[PDB]
Structure 1
Amino acid sequence: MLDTNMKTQLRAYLEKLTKPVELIATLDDSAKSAEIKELLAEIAELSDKVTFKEDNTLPVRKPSFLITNPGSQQGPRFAGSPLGHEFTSLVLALLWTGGHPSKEAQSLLEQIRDIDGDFEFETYYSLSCHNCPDVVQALNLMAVLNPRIKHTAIDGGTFQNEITERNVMGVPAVFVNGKEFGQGRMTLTEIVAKVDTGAEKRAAEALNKRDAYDVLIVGSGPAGAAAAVYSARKGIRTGLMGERFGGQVLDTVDIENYISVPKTEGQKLAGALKAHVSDYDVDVIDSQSASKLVPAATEGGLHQIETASGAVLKARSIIIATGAKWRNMNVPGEDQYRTKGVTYCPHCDGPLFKGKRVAVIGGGNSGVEAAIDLAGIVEHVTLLEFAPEMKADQVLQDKVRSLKNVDIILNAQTTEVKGDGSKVVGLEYRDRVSGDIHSVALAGIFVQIGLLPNTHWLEGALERNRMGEIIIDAKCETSVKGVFAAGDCTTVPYKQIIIATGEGAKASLSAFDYLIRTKIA
């Protein structure tokens, strides 16, 4: 059943709905059906914009419910329990249906809304499974975005019978129009690339007719832009493809460590990178997502990059510069206070809180070192570690535990970020041991949870470490000849703009060397 903290979190999330949401259930006399009925009734009382209706006559699984807006039959459907690890999947399905935007690439969202064709997806999950959430969330978002795409996420614990009849060997297990589609972790980009394989739009057909490149750079944040300038300066045929030019820089509000520029803005630096790239002959391709790398069958041959849009670009050398997603706490309040107290930048804004109190989320070496540094300039620091013991090396723990102005909370998970509409003013978190919720007043929150390199699409194609970073050497060479990598998606120790531009340059020079050594004279 929903426990007290899930109800508290859900209420906070739902205050944000801008459009009404209706939960339509189809139930039978089973015990599980009674749990679902009680669950939906409990969710509906948390918000004025959410209502519960039941129609036991519909030709759908029992129990199951549709998440939609009044007056429509559009939306994802959950068959069985949507709690456990799918709680966040349920929260997102409610918020997106209620008008909340997705954080996915805008070009990807647009391609999903334009998908032609009918696709009925079904995904089997288990409440304890850790990789099902991403898959369920990706397909639910597609169903919210395009009425021609249906999705029913099925709880394997409730429809145990189906899992044996259909040979499901592991979760998450996805079927589309009756046939196996995929198993295991999958990103929205990879799902879209696999399903929208028909006559591609104008953009795709055009890309398919481009001549092969001497170097194609994938991703256009600072590392890729830097590579593009260096390559074009050598006069070779250069392609730079990416989702949106500028990478993380574009949305950054204040930057004070891009060497030689005391202070600039994300939009202006991104614009300057664009102007530097436009000073040369570079084919800049925007609004495209690379979905697959197919290595050259021979030395001096061509590598291929497939895109989500269905096109295939080809080149003599490749530079991967897709960056990384920066992990969130995923709690109510976080998005709203995104530029008003919640800080994700790895090495900035500390002097901003001199004389104030802050928190650091994460107890690994970076988290503990971030606390030690902040302790030197802020009035106070609260550090929250999810595990029962800090993960940092011993020597760091010993030093952080000797600082009077720092408090270490173990076995804790943030449950909410509080504000007054203008700035952050506190956070609430939960003691994993006892379930109790505690509050703490503060002006800043430094999230230092981790990074998620945008490299899943390269799985099995280039060697990566356990965290997903592409392994490179000093020359930015990968495990595949002619393929290089630069920036935050690689094993480079620190993630900064000036570091990424320097890596992009190195990768471009290595690719140039590789080209002269292998290109036919």
Structure 2
Amino acid sequence: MLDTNMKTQLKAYLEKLTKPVELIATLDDSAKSAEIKELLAEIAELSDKVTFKEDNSLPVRKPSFLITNPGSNQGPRFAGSPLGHEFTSLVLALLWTGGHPSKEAQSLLEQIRHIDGDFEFETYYSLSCHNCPDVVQALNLMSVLNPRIKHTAIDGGTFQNEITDRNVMGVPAVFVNGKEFGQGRMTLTEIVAKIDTGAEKRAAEELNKRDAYDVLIVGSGPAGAAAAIYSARKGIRTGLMGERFGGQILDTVDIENYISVPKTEGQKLAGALKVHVDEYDVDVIDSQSASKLIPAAVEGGLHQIETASGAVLKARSIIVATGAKWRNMNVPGEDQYRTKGVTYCPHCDGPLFKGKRVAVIGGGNSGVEAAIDLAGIVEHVTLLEFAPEMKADQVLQDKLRSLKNVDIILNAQTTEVKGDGSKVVGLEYRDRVSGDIHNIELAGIFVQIGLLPNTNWLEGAVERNRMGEIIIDAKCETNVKGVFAAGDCTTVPYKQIIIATGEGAKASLSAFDYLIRTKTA
């Protein structure tokens, strides 16, 4: 059935086999069966690595044959004649079964190899169809690669019954698991995309595929964004990963101390940050949390960051910019009146309360100094301390107790923030000793209970001070070579947007200098 040319090419290609191949035929008494039996015997003659066997008891189309390895029943089946245009397909199926490599990208083949699901493909062709072979070959390859993907290529010229029955009006025509699948010149990639959709596959899988970063910035508030802009501007491979782009500013309304901008809003400032970052094609990763830092085992190595989602990213340098949580009172009304008189920051909102009465919650240094600060510009301040005594430095306590527009209330626990539906009008608190409930009328409540830097995930890796802050020097260096930190999560002494952005720029320039100096190759 092979002319002498086809036969000369085949002996050559068959030399390329590294594994034995069996051709297992299941035949009837038709001339077509005789033709197939002749072909398979002629192929087996061309190589000791190919053997032809017959099993006419099998419950499969007649004539058909399986291409497989000894001991195995895996591989493509041709039903009817595999010559005409399909000769190339037959040869390729032999080569692949016998160990010769495919020319497809190995990542694609590995994907096919590990497709989880059972798929029985059937493809109708005709011998004179110029376009069929590419499709037959793609599905053949899939069946060689994955025992759960089966393929029977069917010669419509032999099984004309099925052509009419299934109303196949054009070829190549593909079926899967009893349903029509597609027609025409589809590619292996397109076929896989249809059966292995990637629908509802986690971002973590994709994150594991990322190459190593030159710098990976963890946290995407103003410090991280600044760092990302400075880094990408130098042309290095810059990743910026964070839980929520924008950080704390996203949840604030009015901002009047972002230097050069008399008044803006948090959401707008966050959006401006995103535009600035995106000008430089930073790889921005959102809704991910770093859960562990694995320090590089050698200078010039790679640091790694594990995510809570289970991914691992790698980088030559890291900038940690995870900021802080600002502790809440956790009382009714607090959330309702955030931005409407409940505030966590005297530097930010102090000026809004000129001529108003306010409270400060907390009698540590922050709270006491906040109270002394506010007492300079507001009508009246009441400081509430939960404990029986203030914790602030004695000089501050003495200074506060000397102000005439200040009341200090000890053993006081806020029980509710009160407003009028739009703004704060007072607060209610309980004396923790007597249990008595009291009320103060006011327009503002400055919560000064404490900050919780977002740094517990670094315990044991990066040195932190007694308050949880990452210890940095003026260059934003930490105790780990190639790890830098910027913004509120650090020992930087004040926590403001303009301060954080400055620090992010510094940390970025330090990381860059570090990269220059550890390319000692």
TM-score bracket, shorter-length normalisation: 0.5 to 0.7
Displacement of 1:388: 1.5
Asked if structure 2 preserves the Cα contact closer than 8 Å seen for 1:105 and 1:243, the reply is no
Partner secondary structure for residue 332 of structure 2 = coil
Inter-partner Cα distance in structure 1 for 2:157 and 2:325: 32
Inter-partner Cα distance in structure 2 for 1:372 and 1:510: 38
Counterparts in 2 of 1:466 and 1:232: CA distance versus 1, 3 Å: same
Partner secondary structure for residue 66 of structure 2 = strand
Which one is further off, 393-402 or 172-181? 172-181
Pairing 1:368–2:368 present:
yes
Which one is further off, 128-137 or 234-243? 128-137
Asked if structure 2 preserves the Cα contact closer than 8 Å seen for 1:454 and 1:489, the reply is yes
Inter-partner Cα distance in structure 1 for 2:432 and 2:11: 20
Inter-partner Cα distance in structure 1 for 2:29 and 2:127: 22
Inter-partner Cα distance in structure 2 for 1:148 and 1:353: 71
In structure 2, what is the equivalent of residue 470 of structure 1? 470
Inter-partner Cα distance in structure 1 for 2:82 and 2:150: 17
Partner secondary structure for residue 398 of structure 2 = helix
Inter-partner Cα distance in structure 2 for 1:465 and 1:401: 31
Counterparts in 2 of 1:226 and 1:338: CA distance versus 1, 3 Å: same
1:193-241 deviation digits (Å, cap 9, x = unpaired): 9999999933111111111000000000000000001111111110000
Counterparts in 2 of 1:91 and 1:267: CA distance versus 1, 3 Å: farther
Inter-partner Cα distance in structure 2 for 1:333 and 1:84: 81
Which one is further off, 215-224 or 242-251? 242-251
Counterparts in 2 of 1:226 and 1:187: CA distance versus 1, 3 Å: farther
Inter-partner Cα distance in structure 1 for 2:410 and 2:311: 49
Name structure 2 gaps, 5 residues minimum: none
Asked if structure 1 preserves the Cα contact closer than 8 Å seen for 2:252 and 2:339, the reply is no
Asked if structure 2 preserves the Cα contact closer than 8 Å seen for 1:200 and 1:311, the reply is no
Inter-partner Cα distance in structure 2 for 1:116 and 1:302: 34
Displacement of 1:518: 1.1
1:35-79 deviation digits (Å, cap 9, x = unpaired): 999999999999999999999999999999999999999999999
Which one is further off, 163-172 or 291-300? 163-172
Partner secondary structure for residue 175 of structure 1 = strand
Inter-partner Cα distance in structure 1 for 2:129 and 2:473: 35
Asked if structure 2 preserves the Cα contact closer than 8 Å seen for 1:417 and 1:427, the reply is yes
Displacement of 1:349: 2.1
Inter-partner Cα distance in structure 2 for 1:32 and 1:267: 74
Asked if structure 2 preserves the Cα contact closer than 8 Å seen for 1:487 and 1:495, the reply is yes
1:141-199 deviation digits (Å, cap 9, x = unpaired): 99999999999999999999999999999999999999999999999999999999999
1:437-459 deviation digits (Å, cap 9, x = unpaired): 21111111010111000111111
Which one is further off, 117-126 or 447-456? 117-126
Name structure 1 gaps, 5 residues minimum: none
Which one is further off, 182-191 or 489-498? 182-191
Counterparts in 2 of 1:360 and 1:520: CA distance versus 1, 3 Å: same
Displacement of 1:348: 2.2
Between structure 1 and structure 2, the one with the greater Rg is: 2
Asked if structure 2 preserves the Cα contact closer than 8 Å seen for 1:383 and 1:408, the reply is yes
Asked if structure 2 preserves the Cα contact closer than 8 Å seen for 1:306 and 1:313, the reply is yes
Inter-partner Cα distance in structure 2 for 1:171 and 1:409: 87
Inter-partner Cα distance in structure 2 for 1:434 and 1:66: 90
Counterparts in 2 of 1:123 and 1:367: CA distance versus 1, 3 Å: farther
Asked if structure 1 preserves the Cα contact closer than 8 Å seen for 2:230 and 2:505, the reply is yes
Which one is further off, 4-13 or 506-515? 4-13
Asked if structure 2 preserves the Cα contact closer than 8 Å seen for 1:13 and 1:332, the reply is no
Inter-partner Cα distance in structure 2 for 1:111 and 1:225: 36
Which one is further off, 106-115 or 242-251? 106-115
Partner secondary structure for residue 121 of structure 1 = strand
Inter-partner Cα distance in structure 2 for 1:153 and 1:461: 59
Asked if structure 2 preserves the Cα contact closer than 8 Å seen for 1:123 and 1:174, the reply is yes
Counterparts in 2 of 1:418 and 1:283: CA distance versus 1, 3 Å: same
Inter-partner Cα distance in structure 2 for 1:376 and 1:80: 96
Counterparts in 2 of 1:164 and 1:48: CA distance versus 1, 3 Å: same
Inter-partner Cα distance in structure 2 for 1:499 and 1:57: 82
Partner secondary structure for residue 133 of structure 1 = helix
In structure 1, what is the equivalent of residue 186 of structure 2? 186
Counterparts in 2 of 1:85 and 1:389: CA distance versus 1, 3 Å: farther
Counterparts in 2 of 1:199 and 1:469: CA distance versus 1, 3 Å: farther
Which one is further off, 178-187 or 298-307? 178-187
Asked if structure 2 preserves the Cα contact closer than 8 Å seen for 1:75 and 1:150, the reply is yes
Counterparts in 2 of 1:130 and 1:367: CA distance versus 1, 3 Å: farther
Counterparts in 2 of 1:78 and 1:47: CA distance versus 1, 3 Å: same
| TM-score, normalization by structure 1 | 0.62
1:223-279 deviation digits (Å, cap 9, x = unpaired): 000000111111111000011111111121011111111111111111111111111
Counterparts in 2 of 1:37 and 1:209: CA distance versus 1, 3 Å: closer
Counterparts in 2 of 1:305 and 1:95: CA distance versus 1, 3 Å: farther
Partner secondary structure for residue 150 of structure 1 = strand
Displacement of 1:351: 2.7
Which one is further off, 20-29 or 437-446? 20-29
Displacement of 1:433: 1.8
1:6-63 deviation digits (Å, cap 9, x = unpaired): 9999999999999999999999999999999999999999999999999999999999
Inter-partner Cα distance in structure 1 for 2:9 and 2:361: 19
Inter-partner Cα distance in structure 1 for 2:421 and 2:144: 29
1:288-340 deviation digits (Å, cap 9, x = unpaired): 11111111111111111011111111000000000000000111111111121
Counterparts in 2 of 1:223 and 1:495: CA distance versus 1, 3 Å: same
Which one is further off, 344-353 or 300-309? 344-353
Q: How does 1:167-246 map to 2 (within 5 A)?
A: 201-246=201-246
Asked if structure 2 preserves the Cα contact closer than 8 Å seen for 1:289 and 1:307, the reply is yes
Q: Say what the alpha-carbon RMSD is for the aligned residues.
A: 26.7
Which one is further off, 145-154 or 388-397? 145-154
Counterparts in 2 of 1:496 and 1:158: CA distance versus 1, 3 Å: farther
Counterparts in 2 of 1:132 and 1:497: CA distance versus 1, 3 Å: farther
Asked if structure 1 preserves the Cα contact closer than 8 Å seen for 2:346 and 2:374, the reply is no
In structure 2, what is the equivalent of residue 45 of structure 1? 45
Asked if structure 2 preserves the Cα contact closer than 8 Å seen for 1:215 and 1:239, the reply is yes
Inter-partner Cα distance in structure 2 for 1:247 and 1:279: 19
Inter-partner Cα distance in structure 2 for 1:273 and 1:127: 62
Partner secondary structure for residue 108 of structure 1 = helix
Pairing 1:151–2:158 present:
no
Counterparts in 2 of 1:92 and 1:351: CA distance versus 1, 3 Å: farther
Counterparts in 2 of 1:519 and 1:9: CA distance versus 1, 3 Å: closer
What is the number of residues matched between the two proteins?
521
Partner secondary structure for residue 347 of structure 2 = coil
In structure 2, what is the equivalent of residue 165 of structure 1? 165
Partner secondary structure for residue 335 of structure 1 = helix
Inter-partner Cα distance in structure 1 for 2:217 and 2:452: 20
Which one is further off, 500-509 or 377-386? 377-386
Inter-partner Cα distance in structure 2 for 1:6 and 1:413: 93
Asked if structure 2 preserves the Cα contact closer than 8 Å seen for 1:355 and 1:378, the reply is yes
In structure 1, what is the equivalent of residue 515 of structure 2? 515
Which one is further off, 119-128 or 41-50? 41-50
Counterparts in 2 of 1:402 and 1:293: CA distance versus 1, 3 Å: same
Inter-partner Cα distance in structure 2 for 1:254 and 1:111: 51
Inter-partner Cα distance in structure 1 for 2:156 and 2:411: 30
Inter-partner Cα distance in structure 2 for 1:14 and 1:379: 96
Counterparts in 2 of 1:113 and 1:345: CA distance versus 1, 3 Å: farther
